[PDB]
Paper text:
Lassa virus (LASV) nucleoprotein (NP) is the only known 3′-5′ exoribonuclease that can suppress type I interferon (IFN) production possibly by degrading immune-stimulatory RNAs.
To determine the structural basis for the possible differential activity of TCRV NP in IFN suppression, we crystallized the TCRV NP-C domain (residues 364–569) and determined its three-dimensional structure at 1.8 Å. The five conserved catalytic residues from TCRV NP-C were located at almost identical positions as those of the LASV NP-C with some minor conformational changes. The potential dsRNA-interacting interface of TCRV NP also largely resembled that of LASV NP. A noted difference was that residues Ser-485, Gly-423, and Pro-390 in TCRV NP were located at the corresponding positions of residues Lys-488, Asp-426, and Arg-393 of the LASV NP, respectively. We found that TCRV NP could process both ss- and dsRNA templates with similar efficiency and substrate preference as those of the LASV NP. Taken together, our data strongly suggest that TCRV NP, like the NP proteins of LASV and other arenaviruses, has active 3′-5′ exoribonuclease activity and can effectively suppress IFN production, results that are in sharp contrast to the previously published report.
Author numbering: 358 to 513, 524 to 564
The structure:
């Protein structure tokens, strides 16, 4: 408990989680399977804020599937992610918090694995077309928020846009609201802390 080389990261995450208001809508999305997640985002539109972090997968062979066909995150761009950050964020979430999601199955599993059966999920149950209404607009306006999706998406016309946990949250909220947010949410976790020097 005393002397950790990751004391800073821990304090940063604690400070970020303390900013979450359990009275407001909070979105959560992950990329990667719930057993080996590689990207996590929480987004609270009412406070114009988000928590966003990464982790290196433990199953590198399995990671290839999501990388090529879903999220487009290359191993090179997350191999230096500080381990445990993603789990620490989940561990700190307030008791019994209501979390908004699109497609609850994998998130439920993720949270259950983390022993967070107390967290409650709303699934907005969008169709794919509904969920991604604002995809191009979100990448145009907010794409600079995540530069970690550099792999071309293969179809197992034109390549699909890769899925980013953060931009997914933003575009899902935009779909629910009918419009993109006023302007630019603010990161609660400084990017430089998500990765090894
Ligand atoms: Mg997603
Ligand atoms: Zn991303």
């Amino acid at each position: 408990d005393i002397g950790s080389e990751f004391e800073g990261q821990e304090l940063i995450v604690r400070a970020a989680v303390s900013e979450l208001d359990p009275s407001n809508t909070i979105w959560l999305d992950i990329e990667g399977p719930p057993t080996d997640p590689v990207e996590l985002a929480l987004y609270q539109p009412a406070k114009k804020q988000y928590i966003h972090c990464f982790r290196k997968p433990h199953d590198e062979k399995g990671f290839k599937n999501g990388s090529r066909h879903s999220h487009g995150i290359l191993m090179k761009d997350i191999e230096d992610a500080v381990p445990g950050v993603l789990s620490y964020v989940i561990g700190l979430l307030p008791p019994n918090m209501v979390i908004t999601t699109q497609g609850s199955d994998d998130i439920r599993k993720l949270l259950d694995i983390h022993g967070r059966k107390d967290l409650k999920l709303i699934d907005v149950k969008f169709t794919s077309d509904q969920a991604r209404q604002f995809e191009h607009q979100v990448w145009d306006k907010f794409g600079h928020l995540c530069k970690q999706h550099n792999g071309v998406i293969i179809s197992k016309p034109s390549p699909d846009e890769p899925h980013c946990a953060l931009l997914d949250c933003i575009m899902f909220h935009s779909a629910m609201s009918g419009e993109l947010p006023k302007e630019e949410p603010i990161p609660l976790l400084p990017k430089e802390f998500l990765f090894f020097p």
